[PDB]
């Protein structure tokens, strides 16, 4: 369980948070 979340976070960390958030915002609007 908890391990799956940590592993997941390790994957997301590969991306640029500032860019990710910009793109999510465009996707929404």
């Amino acid at each position, epitope marked *: 369980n908890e391990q799956e979340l940590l592993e997941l976070d*390790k994957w997301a960390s590969l991306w*640029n948070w500032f860019d990710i958030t910009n793109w999510l915002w465009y996707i929404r609007r």
Partner: antibody
Amino acid sequence: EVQLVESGGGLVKPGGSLRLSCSASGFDFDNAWMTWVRQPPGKGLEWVGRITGPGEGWSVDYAAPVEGRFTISRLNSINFLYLEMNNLRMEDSGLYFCARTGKYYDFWSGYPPGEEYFQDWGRGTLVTVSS
Amino acid sequence: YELTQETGVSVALGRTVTITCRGDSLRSHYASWYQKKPGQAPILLFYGKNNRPSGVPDRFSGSASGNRASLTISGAQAEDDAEYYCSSRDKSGSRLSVFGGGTKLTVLS
């Protein structure tokens, strides 16, 4: 499990330099965003700066009054965060905390770049700038 | 002073109190909330839309509307007597963060 321990605070003259350290344990330090916060005497918490992760190429942002004088860095192999301070001023005097920093973004209502928040804190190390 | 909080608020033991954080950035960004007692590291209480970390009592909850964020304590305990800080972006869409000036909460117990 999460432990944060700052050191390197002391007395230093105006114009001087100082390097603070924070050793971290009990969490994935390599991927964690890390923030420095300070509390001047008699006053509140003040955000100093934050270093990001591998995804962001370890970029750093700094509070305006501190920009150009402070440098935040990290050594992931030994789980350390560092604050190098140059050209120190009396107003820099105070209690420095390092903080494990989380990131939040609400897909439906959020606005980039979402928010950062401070999940774990050290006990802090005391900086005194005075002649 | 991008984020403003009450200087001091008092509440009777076991009653309900709300403290606020105000600033332009809060229109766009959620706030996080921290308890701080003298000579102790701050503690995270609440963040984002509706997130209370494990370990925080359920009597703590945050909300938001317009340029205001609020922290509510439903049934104040003696140990809630402390300083509270909010944090958020300094400006809408900024990569920087900032704290409000802090509120001293007196629980008369």
